[PDB]
Amino acid sequence: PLESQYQVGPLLGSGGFGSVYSGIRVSDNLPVAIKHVEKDRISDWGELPNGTRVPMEVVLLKKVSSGFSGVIRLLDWFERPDSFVLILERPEPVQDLFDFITERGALQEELARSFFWQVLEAVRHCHNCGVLHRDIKDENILIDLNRGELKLIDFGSGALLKDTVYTDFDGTRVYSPPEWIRYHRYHGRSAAVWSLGILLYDMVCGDIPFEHDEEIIRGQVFFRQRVSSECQHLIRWCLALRPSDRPTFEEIQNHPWMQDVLLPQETAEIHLHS
């Protein structure tokens, strides 16, 4: 019943999400990640089913924790005078999609298809559980390099899912949709599909398509790499300017470009030198 049940390792990263460390649970040498969030710096707070104030990330992680390996699982959490400490699972070996794309450039379509499909399955899982991520992007995706499995992380900018309009947003601007930029209003699903469009382009071209607000609003997509027409079609669909013109998750998964996806294990054998 303390913090010394884990042997703390090196710092993995720090940013708007706080500070995350590599760790090992001494109880059984299980690889873990240890995230510390200062209370002053917490955006949105939630409340646990049993009445007690916690960071929204904790509520959301509990709602999605299950057998599904598509989302990083919350093993435990603690409260401190001025911070919260989350204990999360940690694949080993691992690499985040942002670094993987920095090192390999534009990913081959077969690989981007496997990864994109897995992201789709995970976002669907979150939505079934009543959770909206709101910061889907390469830096918030981990690759279990041995099994070829992607895991979604960092629900700190997330919210309970609803059908009404959202007037707040604290995720990544360049992954944010035109309707946010222009009116500070979005619906959850359509906004998610837009970020998924940004993420697919990122995967197949090696960089995000838009850097400035004027480009997001204009919505014209230029391809800087060789990309098949089907893939270009799916990306442009996801990046439709009107929210209602974007595809649903079902429409994305039944799109011609998404057929014959490789299983994660096959994916690691062919593309991850596993």
Which is nearest to 164 in space by CA: 188, 182, 184? Answer: 188
Dist CA 5 CA 7 (whole Å): 7
Q: Is the separation of the CB atoms in 194 and 246 below 8 Å?
A: yes
Q: Which residues contact 28 (CB under 8 A, 6 or more apart)?
A: none
Write down the least CB distance from residue 31 to ligand MYU, Å: 8
Q: Which stretch binds ligand MYU (CB under 6 A): 88-96, 160-168, 225-233, 252-260?
A: 88-96
> Which residue among 44, 99, 135, 170 is the active-site one?
135
Instruction: Report cis status (omega within 30 of 0) of the bond before 81.
Output: no
16 assigned binding-site residue = yes
Task: Give the H or E element holding residue 223.
Answer: none
Most distant CA pair in the chain, distance: 56
Task: Give the H or E element holding residue 154.
Answer: none
The one among 20, 120, 191, 252 contacting ligand MYU by CB under 6 A: 20
Residues in contact with ligand MYU, shown as a per-residue x/- string from 125 to 154 under the rule CB under 6 A: -----------------x----------xx
Q: Is the separation of the CB atoms in 191 and 233 below 8 Å?
A: no
CB atoms within 10 A of CB 211: 11
Select 139 or 215, whichever has its Cβ closest to ligand MYU. 139
**Residue 135 a catalytic site member:** yes
Residue 151 CA, distance from chain mean position: 8
Select 152 or 216, whichever has its Cβ closest to ligand MYU. 152
Q: Is 33 in the site for ligand MYU (CB under 6 A)?
A: yes
The one among 35, 113, 133, 271 contacting ligand MYU by CB under 6 A: 35
20 assigned binding-site residue = yes
Select 15 or 51, whichever has its Cβ closest to ligand MYU. 15
CA angle 232, 70, 269 (to 5 degrees): 70
Interface with ligand MYU (CB under 6 A), residue total 16
Dist CA 186 CA 169 (whole Å): 9
Q: What is the footprint of ligand MYU within residues 44-83 (CB under 6 A)?
A: 72
Residues at the annotated binding site?
12-20, 35, 89, 96
- Residues marked active site are found at 135
- Site of interaction with ligand MYU (CB under 6 A): 12-13, 17, 20, 33, 35, 72, 88-90, 94, 96, 142, 153-154, 156
Residues at the annotated binding site for ATP?
12-20, 35, 89, 96
